[PDB]
Structures are given as structure tokens and as C-alpha cells.
Design a binder for this molecule. Structure first.
Ligand code: MYA
Ligand code: X55
Length: 382
């Protein structure tokens, strides 16, 4: 209906059709110097994630209070080392790791983050931030703390001369530039049925289901191997060229490519295809993000892989993703998740992905442009 907070923000209204390209409002020439006021008993604290104790406090906040499915059965369980990967890419700033603490106990009860990103949106490239990890402790919910967090990070980003942002959320807000759907590929169908993520259908037995989802023990694509340091430039080249075909994409430097793709166990996997000539022609990537399974006596966690960026020039995408599934299965993953963005719709149903509940909406702050189909979205966030 109406949005008490979002109606005040430089975003387009829901329902309106946009036929133009540009900022909702001009760059601000002076910026509020003072932090926005929090409710009594709470205080701002920029979190030094290089401090092990502090990073663990953030881990705990998110582990207990971050995104849950609509049925409150699963919650994201970002690891401390994943958080460090996600939150300290090239150009990261300490003031952009924005925490809220209880004054008396010092308990961490809120967080929001910004990281810098160059973003290509239709015919324009803009320096932006990506906003992520917005979280308010369950005990502080529905107390309008989130608008304060959003305004405060906005202010801190403005101070650095940045006036646009990109973000995703499961909720519908003014106004999505793209709407995506999560799809899931069962790797361990037994466990997934046991924990009620998926259901054993009427026309299939467990024996049939396990047979349906059974995968080869090793990948089939010739010359597929983990990305190494020597592959950083070619991965950068391949990615840059591949992304041109989409309408919302990152523009990554070679240093950013090293950060986002160089393999780190239990965080990010990247495999390249090195052909018979020694040329790298393709790559696949996926990140590691487990979920907590709540209120279960025996199964406490679900290990999930998330499709990241997959670039093909000589190996068909279908083959690359088949190998991604096999590699994920080998590494002990229970499920493989992918969005319906980029060219993913060409392989999702073929490789036995099932559609998930809920949407992932893509948003831009202070940028008005026509909305795009999922197939034109070429940006994947953590
Ligand atoms: C130039 C720089 C710009 C930088 C900033 C760019 C914008 C970035 C924007 C943020 C990008 C975040 C990206 C991610 O991290 S998406 C992940 C979000 N996190 C979670 O879902 C974790 C679990 N949930 C919580 O912690 C929450 O309940 C939160 C913190 C989400 C809301 O806390 P609470 O439940 O206690 O509610 P409130 O009473 O305080 O406040 C209610 C208001 O908040 C609006 N709301 C609710 N959910 C979201 C949401 N996910 N994005 C934007 N707005 C949201 C809601 O419509 C209402 O406004 P309005 O309806 O009255 O208008
Ligand atoms: C349960 O329905 C889904 C929930 C999620 C998110 S919400 C909290 C969480 O932990 N998830 C990761 C997960 C949990 C379980 C299976 C696969 C992925 C996603 Br993304 C897509 C779904 O369809």
C-alpha cells in the first residue's frame, strides 16, 4: 500500500513505468556530519572485523538473527571467514561496517554494511556501493531500527562521494529493477527430505528420487581444474567480455577478480577449463553458504553451494553446470542453488533444478531506469 520509510527515499514508486535513465536526485553538495540518533540505550560502533572477537560477535548476530525462510525452518549461517571475504574486498572502508550495540552490556544487536562496487547499468557505469547484511536482533524487531541503519549507512556512503547503491532482498520494496527466482538442485535428496526442505512426491519413491538426482563421481569436461594465480588475468578477461551481454553487471578490476574468484576452501570455488593448447576458455564458480536447520534433534546444518559467475566460450554452459553439480557433490554439499538470471534458464530445468519459494528482487538506490527480465541481470551478490 504505502511505505512510511521508502516513500521518503530517492527510489521510483511501485507500479510506475520508467522510460528514462538517470539519478532520482542530484549528488548532494553537503552532507550531514552527525550520525543519526538511535533509540535510547543503543550506540553506533564501527566493527573492526580484523579483530577476532569482534568478527565472532558479528558471526553470532547473523547466525542467530539473519535471513530465515518464510516458514522459519532454515537460517543463513555465514562463516566468520566468509564474512571477511564478503566484507573486505578491495576498497573496503571501516566506517562501512556499521554496528549497533546495547550501551550497558555492549551486546551487538544491529548491523549493516556497504562495500564499493563499480556497476554497469544499461549504458552507464557508476561507482556504487553494495549494501548487505542488514540485521536487527529479534528482540529489537518492528521498532523502526532498520530505517535508522539505512539512513546511517547512506550518510556514511555520501561522505565518500558515492550517491548510488545496489542491493537485493526477498521483500518487495519501491522499486525492483529486476525480479529473480532461486532454483535448487538436490545433491543429497535423503537429507533434504528428512529436514523437510523438499518432499518425497506421490508418483516417486525414495529409491526413484535418489536415482533421479544421482550424479557422476568426477567431472567430464576436459582440462577442468581449480583456478590458480596464473589464471587471474584470463579469468578477468573472460568475465569482462561475457558480462557485456547483460544490463546490470559488475565492472571488476583484476584485483577484484582475484578477490572474488581465487579459491578459498569453504568460501569460494572456481574451476577453469584449460584446453589442449593450454588456453583457459571457460570457468565455473560457486560460493559456500551453509544454513542452520532450527529445532531439529539430529540435523543441525545444511551445506549449500551457490552459483556465482559461470563463463563459457568453448564449453557449452550445460556441460559446465553439470560439472559444477558434480564438484559440489564431491565437496559434500547437500544442495546447489542458482538464480534464474543471466543464461541460467537454459540449464535449470535440464539439470533437474526445482523452483524455490519466494523471489529475489534487485534494487538500485537513487537510479531510475526501466526494469529488466532476469535474463538481463548479470550481477550476483553474497
Ligand atoms: C548511496 C548509498 C545508499 C545506501 C543505502 C541503500 C539502500 C539499502 C536498503 C537496505 C538493503 C538491505 C539488503 C539486505 O541486507 S537484505 C537482508 C535483510 N535482512 C534480513 O532479512 C535479516 C532478518 N531480518 C531482520 O533483521 C529485519 O527484520 C530487518 C533488519 C530487515 C528489518 O527490521 P525490522 O523488521 O525490525 O523492521 P523495522 O521496523 O525496523 O523497519 C521497518 C522498515 O524496514 C523496511 N524493510 C524491511 N526489510 C527490509 C529490507 N530487507 N530492506 C530494506 N528495507 C526493509 C520495511 O519495509 C519498513 O519500511 P517501510 O515499509 O515502512 O517503508
Ligand atoms: C527453504 O526455502 C528457501 C530458503 C532460502 C534461504 S532462506 C534461509 C536459508 O537458510 N536459505 C538457504 C537455503 C535453505 C535450505 C535450502 C536451500 C537454501 C533460499 Br536462498 C531459497 C529457498 O527456496
Amino acid at each position: 500500500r504505502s511505505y512510511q520509510f521508502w516513500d521518503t527515499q530517492p527510489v521510483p514508486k511501485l507500479g510506475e513505468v520508467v522510460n528514462t535513465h538517470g539519478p532520482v536526485e542530484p549528488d548532494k553538495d553537503n552532507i550531514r556530519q552527525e550520525p543519526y540518533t538511535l533509540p535510547q540505550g543503543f550506540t553506533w560502533d564501527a566493527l573492526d572485523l580484523g579483530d577476532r572477537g569482534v568478527l565472532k560477535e558479528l558471526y553470532t548476530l547473523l547466525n542467530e538473527n539473519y535471513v530465515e525462510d518464510d516458514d522459519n525452518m532454515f537460517r543463513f549461517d555465514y562463516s566468520p571467514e566468509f564474512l571477511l571475504w564478503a566484507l573486505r574486498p578491495p576498497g573496503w572502508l571501516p566506517q562501512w561496517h556499521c554496528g549497533v550495540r546495547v550501551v550497558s552490556s555492549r551486546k551487538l544487536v544491529g548491523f549493516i554494511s556497504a562495500i564499493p562496487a563499480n556497476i554497469h547499468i544499461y549504458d552507464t557505469e557508476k561507482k556504487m556501493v553494495e549494501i548487505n547484511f542488514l540485521c536487527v536482533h529479534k528482540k529489537l524487531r518492528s521498532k523502526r531500527v532498520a530505517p535508522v541503519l539505512i539512513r546511517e549507512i547512506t550518510r556514511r556512503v555520501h561522505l565518500e562521494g558515492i550517491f548510488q547503491a545496489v542491493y537485493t532482498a526477498g521483500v518487495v520494496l519501491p522499486k525492483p529493477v529486476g525480479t529473480c527466482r532461486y532454483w535448487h538442485r538436490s545433491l543429497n535428496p535423503r537429507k533434504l527430505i528428512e529436514v523437510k526442505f523438499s518432499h518425497l512426491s506421490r508418483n516417486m519413491t525414495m529409491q526413484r528420487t535418489m536415482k533421479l538426482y544421482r550424479l557422476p563421481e568426477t567431472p567430464k569436461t576436459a582440462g577442468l581444474r581449480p583456478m590458480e594465480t596464473k589464471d587471474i588475468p584470463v579469468v578477468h578477461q573472460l568475465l569482462t567480455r561475457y558480462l557485456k551481454q547483460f544490463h546490470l553487471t559488475p565492472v571488476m578490476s583484476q584485483e577484484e577478480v582475484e578477490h572474488w574468484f581465487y579459491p578459498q576452501e569453504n568460501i569460494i570455488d572456481t574451476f577453469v577449463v584449460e584446453n589442449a593448447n593450454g588456453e583457459v576458455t571457460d570457468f565455473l564458480s560457486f560460493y559456500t553458504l551453509p544454513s542452520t536447520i532450527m529445532n531439529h534433534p539430529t540435523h543441525k546444518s545444511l551445506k549449500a553451494a551457490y552459483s556465482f559467475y559461470n563463463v563459457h566460450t568453448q564449453t557449452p554452459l550445460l556441460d559446465l553446470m553439470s560439472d559444477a553439480l558434480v564438484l559440489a557433490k564431491m565437496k559434500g554439499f547437500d544442495v546447489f542453488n542458482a538464480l534464474d538470471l543471466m543464461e541460467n534458464k537454459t540449464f535449470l530445468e535440464k539439470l533437474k533444478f526445482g523452483i524455490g519459494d519466494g523471489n529475489l528482487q534487485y534494487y538500485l538506490y537513487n537510479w531510475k531506469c526501466p526494469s529488466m527480465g532476469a535474463e538481463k541481470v548479470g550481477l550476483v551478490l553474497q
